[PDB]
Amino acid sequence: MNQCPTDWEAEGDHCYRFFNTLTTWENAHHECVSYSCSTLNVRSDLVSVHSAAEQAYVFNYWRGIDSQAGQLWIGLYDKYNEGDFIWTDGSKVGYTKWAGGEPNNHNNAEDYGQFRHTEGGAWNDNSAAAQAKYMCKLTFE
Amino acid sequence: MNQCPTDWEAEGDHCYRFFNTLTTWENAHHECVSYSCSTLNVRSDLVSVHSAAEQAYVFNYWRGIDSQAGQLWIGLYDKYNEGDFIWTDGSKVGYTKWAGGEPNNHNNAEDYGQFRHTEGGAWNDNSAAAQAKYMCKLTFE
Ligand SMILES: OC[C@H]1O[C@H](O)[C@@H](O)[C@@H](O)[C@@H]1O
Ligand SMILES: OC[C@H]1O[C@H](O)[C@@H](O)[C@@H](O)[C@@H]1O
Ligand SMILES: [Ca+2]
Ligand SMILES: [Ca+2]
Ligand SMILES: [Ca+2]
Ligand SMILES: [Ca+2]
Ligand SMILES: [Ca+2]
Ligand SMILES: [Ca+2]
């Protein structure tokens, strides 16, 4: 039994939804936020990841459905303070899974976090021009 | 863990919330629907009851908070077709638990369904001027 809205998947205290469409981090951020609902205090946002179980759940959900090589935008960013990656949903950043050599802020223009499709979804920072698939998460505040 | 909004209780694939405020059926209906979230296709509505288990869950939840002698509005009414009760949430009436001699359309003016506080919540029809406590339910449409 779960109480997730239709088309959303239950794990723990949260609901998740994969969108199999290439888009920019900024557009994915709006798309996710667009599912919020103030009357039930539901905040929707890009996924934030807080444990190895949450990382795997999200990665396997994604790859269960998308077998193309490519990346998955997450809610991790350093736009407002270069070098300090935080979550858009305001949750704490205890869990990290950086790919080797990442984050590298490559050409001083990478502020937006994404899973790779390899190494269990190891993270990369990428640019505002780049495109990827995305995943949203509900928080019941 | 569940995926209900804060202050709503999870049971099966639904969430429930009791409001310990005496009001009319029409205003209870209004208040419940007010929580709906079209961005997530979440209907909030007066509770509909589809089994003994649902009945008992509802009755026990209510009577754990409210010890007063009185009734509980549910989403059952026969305004449009006298004698042919329907649920406001559009679900079909299968299960019924009418108290003895109900529905009796007393004084030709009882169109609104409610639990009694006795006999496991057996149902009565009452009028548009009557007042009762109310319970809302989320449906993930
Ligand atoms: O992998 C090294 C480098 O590769 C590309 O230039 C981009 O994906 C970068 O974000 C990444 O850091
Ligand atoms: O009128 C309120 C209530 O009065 C009595 O309890 C019964 O006649 C019920 O059928 C009726 O609905
Ligand atoms: Ca920067
Ligand atoms: Ca950066
Ligand atoms: Ca990088
Ligand atoms: Ca009537
Ligand atoms: Ca009637
Ligand atoms: Ca009656």
Write the CATH number for B136. 3.10.100.10
Is B141's CB within 8 Å of A34's CB? Answer: no
Q: Do A141 and B6 touch (CB under 8 A)?
A: yes
Domain count across chain A: 1
CB B88 within 8 A of CB B41: no
**Does B90 contact A at CB distance below 8 Å?**
no
- Decide if B137 contacts B9 (C-beta within 8 A): no
Pairing status of strand A112-115 against strand A123-126: antiparallel
Q: What are the DSSP E strand ranges found in chain B?
A: 9-11, 14-23, 42-46, 72-77, 86-87, 112-115, 123-126, 132-140
Specified resolution (Å): 1.7
CB pair distance less than 8 Å for A13 and B3: yes
Residues 6+ apart with CB under 8 A from B91: B48, B50, B139
In this structure, the strands spanning A72-77 and A131-140 are parallel
* Whether the CB of B68 sits within 6 Å of ligand 2: no
Length of chain B as a residue count: 141
CB B98 within 8 A of CB B110: no
Looking from the CA of residue B99, the nearest atom of ligand 2 is 10
Q: Which residues of A touch B138 (CB under 8 A)?
A: 3, 40
Asked if residue B74 lies in contact with residue B46, where contact means CB atoms within 8 angstroms, the answer is: yes
Which residue of chain B has the CA closest to A10? B3
| CB proximity A8 to B under 8 Å | yes
The amino acid sitting at B125 is: D
In this structure, the residue with its CA closest to atom 12 of ligand 2 is: B126
Please tell me whether the peptide bond between A103 and the residue prior to it is cis, using omega within 30 degrees of 0: yes
How many other C-beta atoms are found inside a 10 Å radius of the C-beta of residue B127?
16
- Tell me the sheet residues that pair with A132: A23
| Structural element, H or E, at residue A45 | strand A42-46
Does the beta-carbon distance from B4 to A3 stay under 8 Å? yes
Domain that holds residue A36: 1-141
Look at residue A27 and give its three-state secondary structure. Answer: helix
- N residues, chain A: 141
